[PDB]
Amino acid sequence: MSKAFDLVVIGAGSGGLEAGWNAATLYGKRVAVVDVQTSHGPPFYAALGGTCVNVGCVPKKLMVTGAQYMDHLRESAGFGWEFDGSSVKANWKKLIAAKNEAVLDINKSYEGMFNDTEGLDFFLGWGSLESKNVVVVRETADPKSAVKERLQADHILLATGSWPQMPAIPGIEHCISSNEAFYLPEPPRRVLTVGGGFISVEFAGIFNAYKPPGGKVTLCYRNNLILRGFDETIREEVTKQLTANGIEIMTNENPAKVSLNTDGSKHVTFESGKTLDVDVVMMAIGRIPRTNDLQLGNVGVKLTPKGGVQVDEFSRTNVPNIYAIGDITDRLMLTPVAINEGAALVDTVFGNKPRKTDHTRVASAVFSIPPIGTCGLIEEVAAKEFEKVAVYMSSFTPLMHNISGSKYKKFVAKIVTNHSDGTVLGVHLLGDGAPEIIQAVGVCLRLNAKISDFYNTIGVHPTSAEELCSMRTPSYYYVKGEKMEKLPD
Amino acid sequence: HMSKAFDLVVIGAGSGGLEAGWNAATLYGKRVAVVDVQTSHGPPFYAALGGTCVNVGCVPKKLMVTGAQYMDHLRESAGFGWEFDGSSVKANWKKLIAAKNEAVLDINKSYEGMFNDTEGLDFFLGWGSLESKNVVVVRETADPKSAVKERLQADHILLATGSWPQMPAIPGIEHCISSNEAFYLPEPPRRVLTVGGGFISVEFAGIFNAYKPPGGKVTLCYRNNLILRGFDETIREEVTKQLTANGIEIMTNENPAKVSLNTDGSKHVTFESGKTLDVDVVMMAIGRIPRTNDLQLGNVGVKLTPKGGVQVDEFSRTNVPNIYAIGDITDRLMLTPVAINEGAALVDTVFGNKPRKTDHTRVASAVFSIPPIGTCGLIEEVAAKEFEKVAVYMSSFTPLMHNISGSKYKKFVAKIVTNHSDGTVLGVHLLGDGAPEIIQAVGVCLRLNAKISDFYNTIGVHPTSAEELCSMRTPSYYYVKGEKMEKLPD
Ligand SMILES: Cc1cc2nc3c(=O)[nH]c(=O)nc-3n(C[C@H](O)[C@H](O)[C@H](O)COP(=O)(O)OP(=O)(O)OC[C@H]3O[C@@H](n4cnc5c(N)ncnc54)[C@H](O)[C@@H]3O)c2cc1C
Ligand SMILES: Cc1cc2nc3c(=O)[nH]c(=O)nc-3n(C[C@H](O)[C@H](O)[C@H](O)COP(=O)(O)OP(=O)(O)OC[C@H]3O[C@@H](n4cnc5c(N)ncnc54)[C@H](O)[C@@H]3O)c2cc1C
Ligand SMILES: COc1ccc(NS(=O)(=O)c2cc(NC(=O)c3ccc([N+](=O)[O-])s3)ccc2OC)cc1
Ligand SMILES: COc1ccc(NS(=O)(=O)c2cc(NC(=O)c3ccc([N+](=O)[O-])s3)ccc2OC)cc1
């Protein structure tokens, strides 16, 4: 049993490492951090640096960047670029290779951060909860496996992230998740992405760009319109723009069973009885908090009906000295949120300056082609919470997208306001640059910006962003939940 | 030989003129005359219905800088495993200009349509000048002794004739061009000199650099030590390195003295230093001068500034009561969205009796250099003079993608200048892909008197270059009563 660690962190993720690093370097505390690999990839995929670094945001972005060149190569003809169209080949093996040494470089720098940091000490293997003051690192997820060491802990931080949700259906063994998608040896000629969420749409675009000749990408979603939770205009518009770039959307369709065909390909039967033959089925239907391997049964840490570690506003479990941040808490499954929770916790605990994460008006993005950037309430959620809601809406084709021959690439800008004071509740953007435009909109909503603060700021011309400063008249309203073009006199 | 009286007569169908005219007409139901010298872009007068921005400014340059970005995209795509015949790549300048001219022409025609479809908003081809304090005469040419097309009776008059390229009086200036002629070159120049350290010189340097024929070269000269005077100094130094890196030669402390034609029609250039250079095109972009000469302001006695701009107060008023000036002719901030805001403020002042004035501080602006610039508010040097203690937050990083791409030089820079007393953000300066789009909403933050703490307490979007603005909590260095230092004195 090790000497007294001030903090023990199970999960070297976006949250864990912020908490660890802040606890150690900032408040001079003695810290232990525990993950299952020191580098990305099979068998466990996530590793030192967390889901983001190894099998999330970082490698994804690189791969969506890769996929954009399909569009750039085609669009450049309008601007009078000329090359041998038959000679164009998308080399998936070189992408993955580059993506792996990029991620691998991050892995090794974290290792160096641990090596160079006093009182911040890394431990390979599977952490679980023995007692309220003891974390046991075993060799595997199996609790009956060899004990690598027991860590004595003043306080304990659960930060094991989340994991792909696979539906219990016949042939689920033949289907994959984002995790495996990151390491496919060759790019799939045909692929089914299952889900209407961000991971399905993003991978649909990546496969769509790198697919060998006569390839095809289908995406299915059990309900009527993809990207539930996002602005409805944008949901309908990013459907049309994925379709336009050669992706088939099957809505109101869900796999019932997958079976292997005699060539090793995958035959898929939808609950509708429809069938489809594809080389890969990627499940991205949700992500579940990663609680199973922690043996929270031992110390009686309460999970929510959902399955996440229940916490209050300060990341505290029902066991006083034990805490949970990140995707394990099953709230906003973002990297910057897990990092904010991490820092607020460590300042709460070791700074006795109790700070909590604001989970409202958080800026987020979907690296679809074309991409999304959003911050705050959709109009539907606003319409229920506020008596009178104004919606400002503007759609336009960036002038370049005339010439480029991608005329479908409409840019959409929506501002949702509390019409009583013109306070901006939400800002929803679809088109090139959206993820970059929305960051500073995040700070505007933090300052309780009103619609008049947007339209009285002078535009930067020519940009898509200036559309946000060009909308003075509501397009329509929601009065006590009910839609209309005008307010009633 | 006179008209029925107009509420407003607008000389210049520009960004500013059309906003004023359109707002006056459709909003306050006024009767409006607008005067410009062409109905479409191009020679002979280049600017036209829609103004400099539409015809020979922001709109066509953006389309062209977009075009030049494919040189980079084609090369960078190799790192993400794209493969094609590198020898087969040709940049076709004729198709760029052609597509650009189709796009600008479609704007020209829709303004014509706007005038056709709008009651009490009437367009008039030709050269407007000031006859009396209540009369604008439209002549057939800039020559005041030319045929009169009509006299417009005017309650109020709006001067909005924009600006025009400054050419230095040197021998061989006749052999040199401006941005105006650059927009119509029949072929792309193998060798070109851009003269000027400002935004037009840099932007065109990048365009010529992407579309130059084989063995071609782009040189940019600037009479002083460091290009882009007025911009953040770190960014000035960093965009010098990034233009160099992409194969553009910067000659600083160098200015043309004379140009002469060589026997093959090429252009032989002598610098004040005695240095010489042979290039196919010399593009002068050394400044832009308010367009006042053709208005005959001598007639009604409208006061120009020492600079040469129409002098105005905060409400766009000349010294002649019912005569106003907005836009580049007022020789202040020479941006389209600023002429548009002045235009709207003037019309609401005049025909709404709700006196409004443009805020010329904390205006967001951009440079569509490769890579680009987005800035809003004070540079640390101007801040250091105005404020007793100034903090500077600074971050430089290579977007991860620019390891893999092989464009490792493409450093992204972020600088926040604060009033250290209250942490009030005075200015935000950005270099790298997306900067012109990041800075827009920063504009609104500065409008709301954001503090550095409002930035670093906003949760980043990941992964983006924009989240670096929310990742800077410690000042890098300070300016105490003008003097620089790493730390504050105890
Ligand atoms: C495909 C994909 C794309 C994404 N894109 C984005 C994006 O663009 N932007 C964004 O903000 N977020 C994105 N995310 C989500 C983001 O990565 C997560 O929100 C974040 O990684 C969760 O942080 P965390 O600290 O909760 O846990 P993680 O960072 O997930 O850390 C968990 C770590 O703990 C380890 N671990 C697990 N169990 C144990 C155990 N029993 N003992 C010890 N260690 C254990 C894991 O191996 C892992 O290394 C994406 C996720 C996915 C799957
Ligand atoms: C190459 C270039 C790039 C630029 N890029 C940008 C940019 O990216 N962003 C930005 O914000 N700004 C940019 N600008 C500046 C922007 O173009 C101007 O600030 C804007 O056009 C000014 O509007 P205005 O109404 O004052 O004048 P203009 O828009 O210039 O309109 C004046 C009009 O008056 C006409 N005219 C002149 N004399 C007469 C006369 N006697 N009678 C009748 N008509 C007359 C002209 O034909 C012209 O159409 C750029 C300028 C140039 C030259
Ligand atoms: C100078 O040439 C123009 C002439 C007229 C106009 N007027 S307008 O088209 O009606 C208009 C446009 C915008 N925003 C866009 O122009 C862009 C976004 C992204 C772009 N870009 O391509 O990146 S351009 C905002 C408000 C607005 O008025 C309601 C604009 C420009
Ligand atoms: C999960 O992957 C991470 C790896 C390392 C870190 N930590 S860090 O390197 O110290 C760091 C990075 C950034 N911004 C960027 O990394 C980018 C912007 C645009 C990019 N781009 O490539 O799209 S990357 C901002 C602040 C900061 O620390 C204060 C974070 C996340």
mmCIF file of C-alpha atoms and ligand atoms in Angstrom, chain A residues 14 49 52-53 57-58 61 106 110 335 339 436, chain B residues 397-401 462-468 471, ligand 4:
data_model
loop_
_atom_site.group_PDB
_atom_site.id
_atom_site.type_symbol
_atom_site.label_atom_id
_atom_site.label_comp_id
_atom_site.label_asym_id
_atom_site.label_seq_id
_atom_site.Cartn_x
_atom_site.Cartn_y
_atom_site.Cartn_z
ATOM 1 C CA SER A 14 -8.964 15.413 -20.853
ATOM 2 C CA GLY A 49 -4.223 11.610 -23.112
ATOM 3 C CA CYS A 52 -9.950 13.029 -27.481
ATOM 4 C CA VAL A 53 -6.187 12.556 -28.082
ATOM 5 C CA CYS A 57 -11.498 15.011 -31.613
ATOM 6 C CA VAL A 58 -7.712 15.025 -32.543
ATOM 7 C CA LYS A 61 -10.205 16.489 -37.219
ATOM 8 C CA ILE A 106 1.062 13.458 -28.200
ATOM 9 C CA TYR A 110 2.327 13.275 -21.855
ATOM 10 C CA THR A 335 -13.249 17.660 -23.988
ATOM 11 C CA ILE A 339 -11.207 20.099 -18.607
ATOM 12 C CA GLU A 436 -14.219 29.047 -35.695
ATOM 13 C CA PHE B 397 1.350 27.384 -32.295
ATOM 14 C CA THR B 398 1.408 25.266 -35.500
ATOM 15 C CA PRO B 399 -2.112 23.914 -36.111
ATOM 16 C CA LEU B 400 -1.515 20.120 -35.903
ATOM 17 C CA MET B 401 -2.702 19.712 -39.569
ATOM 18 C CA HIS B 462 -12.045 21.753 -29.625
ATOM 19 C CA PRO B 463 -10.240 21.396 -31.874
ATOM 20 C CA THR B 464 -10.157 25.013 -33.301
ATOM 21 C CA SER B 465 -7.531 27.852 -33.530
ATOM 22 C CA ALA B 466 -10.227 30.136 -32.020
ATOM 23 C CA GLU B 467 -10.090 28.355 -28.580
ATOM 24 C CA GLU B 468 -6.504 29.774 -28.107
ATOM 25 C CA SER B 471 -6.571 29.686 -23.241
HETATM 26 C C1 LIG C 4 -6.709 16.847 -27.157
HETATM 27 O O1 LIG C 4 -5.673 17.529 -27.869
HETATM 28 C C2 LIG C 4 -4.903 18.419 -27.167
HETATM 29 C C3 LIG C 4 -3.524 18.293 -27.050
HETATM 30 C C4 LIG C 4 -2.816 19.215 -26.298
HETATM 31 C C5 LIG C 4 -3.479 20.267 -25.681
HETATM 32 N N1 LIG C 4 -2.836 21.249 -24.879
HETATM 33 S S1 LIG C 4 -1.941 22.513 -25.386
HETATM 34 O O2 LIG C 4 -1.226 22.031 -26.528
HETATM 35 O O3 LIG C 4 -1.210 22.970 -24.245
HETATM 36 C C6 LIG C 4 -3.023 23.811 -25.921
HETATM 37 C C7 LIG C 4 -3.469 23.771 -27.235
HETATM 38 C C8 LIG C 4 -4.310 24.768 -27.726
HETATM 39 N N2 LIG C 4 -4.757 24.706 -29.068
HETATM 40 C C9 LIG C 4 -4.449 23.742 -29.966
HETATM 41 O O4 LIG C 4 -3.869 22.703 -29.683
HETATM 42 C C10 LIG C 4 -5.030 23.875 -31.309
HETATM 43 C C11 LIG C 4 -5.725 24.893 -31.949
HETATM 44 C C12 LIG C 4 -6.064 24.573 -33.251
HETATM 45 C C13 LIG C 4 -5.616 23.310 -33.584
HETATM 46 N N3 LIG C 4 -5.782 22.673 -34.737
HETATM 47 O O5 LIG C 4 -4.859 21.927 -35.062
HETATM 48 O O6 LIG C 4 -6.950 22.493 -35.088
HETATM 49 S S2 LIG C 4 -4.777 22.510 -32.332
HETATM 50 C C14 LIG C 4 -4.688 25.810 -26.894
HETATM 51 C C15 LIG C 4 -4.244 25.873 -25.588
HETATM 52 C C16 LIG C 4 -3.405 24.893 -25.080
HETATM 53 O O7 LIG C 4 -2.936 24.889 -23.800
HETATM 54 C C17 LIG C 4 -3.093 26.058 -22.997
HETATM 55 C C18 LIG C 4 -4.850 20.384 -25.795
HETATM 56 C C19 LIG C 4 -5.563 19.464 -26.533
#
